[PDB]
C-alpha cells in the first residue's frame, strides 16, 4: 500500500530526525515533500508526525539569521531548522484558512491541524514566529463561531496566560487581540475579555516592569474604547475586568475610572436598569479592594453619590418584573442577585461593618419593605434573607422604627425624596411585615418570624 509505504518512510524520517537531527537536513526537506503530496490520509499522518518532531528538536534559545568544520556543520543545520519550521506555518496558515466541513468519518484538515497548532503554540513561545502561530489564533477567534476548536484555542491561549512567566508571548497575544478589534468593530463573544482575566502578569525587574507597563496601558485602552462603543454584553465582561485590575495603575487614572462610570450613570439616566446594576456592583467591588480600602486614606473613593442613585431607583427597580432571566463578582446576568450584592454591600460593608449612618439604615430598610410588596417570589426570600442579617448586626439602631414609642415626631414622612437623609423614616413605623404574613405563608412567613425572633433576641 502507498499509505503503509508512506507510514514507513514517515517513521524512518521521524526516528532519524529524533535520534540525531544534525546529519539529515535532506530528511527535513523530504519530510516537506511527503507533507506536500495531496493524499488526505497522508496529510493527517504527516502533520501530526512532524508536529512532534519540532516539539523535540527546537532548542531552548533563539537563533539569529546568518546574514553575511563542526561550527559550519551547526549553522547549516540551524538554517535548516528555521526554514523548515517556517514552512510549517504558511502550510498551517493555508490549512487553517481552508474550509471545515466534510464527511463525518473524521476531521479531514481543519480540526486536526488546529489541534496540532494549539499543542505546538503550548511549547513554541520561547521561539520566534509565534506571532504567525498567533495570527492563526486571531484568525480563528475572529470567525465568531462557537466550536470545539474554538474552546481548544481558548484553552490553549489561557494556558499561556497562566504559564508564561516572561510574558513576551502574553504581550504578543494581547497586542494582536487589540489589533483584532480595532480592525473589527466590537464583535467578540466576550471570550478575549475573559482571556484578559486569566492573565497572570496583571495579578529582570526593569524589563518585567516595562512589560507590565505595556500590557497595562494598551489593554485598558481597549476597554476604554469599549465603553465608548457601548456594547451591553461587552460591558459585563469589561466591568468584571475593570473590577479586578483597577488598583495597579496610578492615582489620577484610577480615579478617572470612577468619573468614567459616573458618566455612564448619567448616560443611563438620560437594559438601563441592568446596565446601572452592572455598574452598581462594579463600583462596590473597587471599594471592596483591600489595597483600595487601605487607599481610603490614599484616595477619596466615596459612594454617597451612588447610594442616592440606588435609593431613587429602588422604586423603578421594584416596578420592573424583568428581575429574573436566563465564582464571578460582576458578570452575573440576573438583577435579583445584582440587587442583593448591591444591597449587601450598602447595609453590610466588609470593612467597617458596624460603622454605618443611621438614616441610611432607616430609609433603606423602609424602602426594603416597599420592595417586599412589588417583587416576585424568588427575589423575595433573598431580600428577606438579607434583612435579618441587617438587623441581627445592627439592631437597636434600626429597631426605633418598629416601635412607636421610639418614634421621632419632627415632620411627616416623605417617601419620594432625592436624598436618603431627605426622607425621615424615624416618624413612620413598619407595617409591611403584616402585609407579608398575607403573602404566601409556607416560604415568606418563615423569614418573617426569623426576622422578628432575631429582633426580640436583640
Amino acid at each position: 500500500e502507498q499509505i503503509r509505504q508512506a507510514q514507513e518512510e514517515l517513521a524512518k524520517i521521524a526516528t532519524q530526525l529524533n535520534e540525531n537531527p544534525e546529519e539529515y537536513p535532506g530528511h527535513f526537506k523530504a519530510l516537506a515533500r511527503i507533507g506536500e503530496t495531496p493524499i488526505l490520509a497522508i496529510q493527517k499522518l504527516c502533520i501530526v508526525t512532524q508536529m512532534a518532531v519540532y516539539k523535540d528538536v527546537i532548542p531552548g534559545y533563539r537563533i539569529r539569521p546568518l546574514g553575511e568544520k563542526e561550527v559550519k556543520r551547526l549553522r547549516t543545520y540551524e538554517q535548516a531548522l528555521v526554514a523548515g519550521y517556517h514552512g510549517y506555518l504558511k502550510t498551517l496558515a493555508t490549512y487553517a484558512a481552508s474550509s471545515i466541513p466534510e464527511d463525518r468519518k473524521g476531521e479531514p484538515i481543519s480540526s486536526i491541524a488546529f489541534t496540532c497548532a494549539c499543542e505546538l503554540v503550548n511549547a513554541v513561545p520561547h521561539f520566534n514566529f509565534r506571532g504567525d502561530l498567533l495570527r492563526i489564533l486571531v484568525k480563528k477567534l475572529s470567525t465568531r463561531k462557537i466550536d470545539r476548536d474554538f474552546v481548544k484555542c481558548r484553552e490553549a491561549l489561557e494556558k499561556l496566560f497562566q504559564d508564561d512567566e516572561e510574558g513576551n508571548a502574553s504581550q504578543e497575544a494581547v497586542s494582536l487581540l487589540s489589533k483584532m478589534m480595532k480592525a473589527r468593530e466590537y464583535r467578540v463573544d466576550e471570550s478575549v475579555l475573559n482571556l484578559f482575566l486569566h492573565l497572570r502578569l496583571l495579578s529582570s525587574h526593569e524589563e518585567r516592569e516595562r512589560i507590565q507597563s505595556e500590557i497595562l496601558k494598551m489593554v485598558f485602552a481597549t476597554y476604554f474604547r469599549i465603553l465608548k462603543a457601548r456594547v451591553p454584553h461587552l460591558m459585563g465582561a469589561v466591568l468584571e475586568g475593570l473590577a479586578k485590575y483597577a488598583h495597579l495603575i496610578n492615582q489620577d487614572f484610577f480615579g478617572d475610572l470612577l468619573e468614567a462610570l459616573k458618566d455612564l450613570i448619567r448616560d443611563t439616566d438620560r437594559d438601563t436598569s441592568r446596565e446601572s446594576l452592572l455598574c452598581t456592583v462594579t463600583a462596590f467591588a473597587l471599594l471592596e479592594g483591600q489595597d483600595a480600602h487601605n487607599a481610603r486614606s490614599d484616595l477619596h473613593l466615596d459612594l454617597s453619590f451612588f447610594i442616592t442613585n440606588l435609593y431613587r431607583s429602588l422604586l423603578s427597580l421594584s416596578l420592573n418584573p424583568d428581575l429574573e432571566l436566563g465564582n464571578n463578582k460582576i458578570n452575573l446576568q440576573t438583577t435579583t442577585v445584582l440587587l442583593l450584592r448591591c444591597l449587601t454591600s450598602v447595609l453590610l460593608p466588609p470593612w467597617n461593618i458596624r460603622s454605618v449612618p443611621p438614616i441610611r439604615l432607616a430609609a433603606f430598610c423602609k424602602q426594603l419593605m416597599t420592595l417586599a410588596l412589588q417583587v416576585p417570589e424568588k427575589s423575595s426570600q433573598a431580600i428577606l434573607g438579607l434583612l435579618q442579617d441587617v438587623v441581627h448586626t445592627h439592631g437597636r439602631k434600626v429597631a426605633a422604627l418598629w416601635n412607636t414609642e421610639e418614634r421621632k415626631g419632627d415632620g411627616t414622612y416623605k417617601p419620594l425624596s432625592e436624598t436618603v437623609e431627605g426622607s425621615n423614616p424615624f416618624t413612620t413605623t413598619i407595617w409591611e411585615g403584616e402585609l407579608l404574613r398575607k403573602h404566601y405563608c409556607p416560604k415568606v412567613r418563615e423569614g418573617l418570624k426569623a426576622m422578628e425572633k432575631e429582633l426580640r433576641s436583640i
Binding site: 526516528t15 529524533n18 535520534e19 540525531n20 537531527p21 544534525e22 523535540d56 532548542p59 531552548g60 534559545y61 563542526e70 561550527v71 551547526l74
Partner: protein
C-alpha cells in the same frame, strides 16, 4: 580556552560546567526552593559551587564522584562509585530521614575511543543516575541530567515521560557548540508505588526496535438646491437679511463668467473651466459657523 573558561577563573569557579548550571537555573529556578541536591559525577566541584551559592545556610548538599573532590564549604563530598550498593548506603546514611529535592548529573566518560561507545557509555551513565534518582527524590522533585545526543536518546527521553510529568530537553548557550551534549530537565516526579524493573534495566531499555407607483422628481433636485459652499451660504445670509434683493442677486450673478457654454463641450474642457472660473467673494463668520452646523452630521 573560551570566554566561559575565562569567566570561571575570574569568578573563582573550578570549571565551565558551573556556568551551564546557573543559566539552566536562571531559565527554571529549581535551586531556589530546595534543601537537598544529590550531585552525581560532580568533578571538579563546579556544580557544588553553584549549589552552595544558591540555597539556605542550613540545607544539605551531597556530592558523589569517582574522583576525589577538594573540600567545599556547606557541601559534603565523598568518593564512591554510583552503581554500587555501598554508595547508596552512604547517601542513605547522610540523608537519614530526608529525601532529595533535586538530583543533578554531570556525567561524561573518557571520550576518545569511539563515538558510538562513548555515547552508549554516556547513555547508560545517565541511566545509572536515573535509578539513583528514583528512590532518593522527594515527590515533585527535579531531575537534571547531561547526555550526548545519540540513538538511545529517544529511549532515555521516553522513560523520562513515564516517570516524570514535565520534561524538557535544552541546550544551554553556555555549552560548547561543537559538543554533542544535551541537558534534560525533568519536573514533577509522579511517586509510583511500583517501578518496572525493565524500566530500570539497561539491557531492556537500549534494545534496538525492529396600484399607485407614480413618483414625482423632487428628491434629486433638492440636493442641487441645497447649499454646500460657504460663498453660497453667505449669499443666502445676505438674501435672508434685509440687505440684497432679487434684482441685486441677479446683477451680482452677472459676472465675467456668464453667457458661457456648459452642455455640448467635453468633460475635460468643462472640468478645466470649472476649476478656473471660481470668483472670490467675501465671507462672514456667521456663515462659516452656520455651514459648520450644516455639515455636522449625527
Amino acid at each position: 580556552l573560551d570566554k566561559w573558561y575565562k569567566l570561571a577563573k575570574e569568578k573563582g569557579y573550578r570549571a565551565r560546567a558551573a556556568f551551564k548550571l546557573i543559566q539552566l537555573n536562571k531559565k527554571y529556578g529549581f535551586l531556589e526552593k530546595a534543601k537537598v541536591v544529590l550531585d552525581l559525577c560532580a568533578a571538579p566541584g563546579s556544580w557544588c559551587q553553584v549549589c552552595a551559592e544558591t540555597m539556605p545556610k542550613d540545607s544539605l548538599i551531597i556530592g558523589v564522584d569517582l574522583a576525589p573532590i577538594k573540600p567545599i564549604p556547606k557541601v559534603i563530598t565523598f568518593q564512591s562509585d554510583i552503581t554500587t550498593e555501598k554508595c547508596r548506603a552512604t547517601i542513605r546514611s547522610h540523608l537519614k530521614t530526608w529525601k532529595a529535592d533535586v538530583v543533578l548529573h554531570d556525567g561524561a566518560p573518557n571520550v576518545g575511543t569511539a563515538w558510538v561507545q562513548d555515547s552508549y557509555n554516556q547513555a547508560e551513565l545517565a541511566l545509572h543516575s536515573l535509578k539513583l534518582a528514583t528512590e532518593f527524590l522527594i515527590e515533585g522533585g527535579t531531575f537534571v541530567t547531561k547526555v550526548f545526543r545519540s540513538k538511545d536518546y529517544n529511549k532515555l527521553l521516553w522513560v523520562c515521560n513515564q516517570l516524570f510529568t514535565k520534561v524538557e530537553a535544552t541546550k544551554p548557550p553556555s555549552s560548547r557548540n561543537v559538543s554533542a551534549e544535551i541537558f534534560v530537565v525533568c519536573r514533577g516526579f509522579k511517586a509510583p508505588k511500583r517501578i518496572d524493573p525493565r524500566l530500570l534495566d539497561p539491557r531492556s531499555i537500549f534494545e534496538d526496535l525492529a396600484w399607485e407607483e407614480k413618483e414625482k422628481k423632487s428628491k434629486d433636485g433638492r440636493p442641487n438646491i441645497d447649499i454646500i459652499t460657504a460663498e453660497a451660504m453667505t449669499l443666502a445670509h445676505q438674501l435672508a437679511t434685509g440687505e440684497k434683493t432679487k434684482a441685486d442677486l441677479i446683477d451680482e450673478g452677472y459676472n465675467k463668467y456668464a453667457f458661457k457654454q456648459k452642455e455640448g463641450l467635453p468633460d475635460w474642457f468643462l472640468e478645466d473651466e470649472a476649476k478656473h472660473d471660481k470668483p472670490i467673494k467675501p465671507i462672514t463668520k456667521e456663515a462659516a459657523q452656520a455651514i459648520k452646523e450644516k455639515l455636522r452630521a449625527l
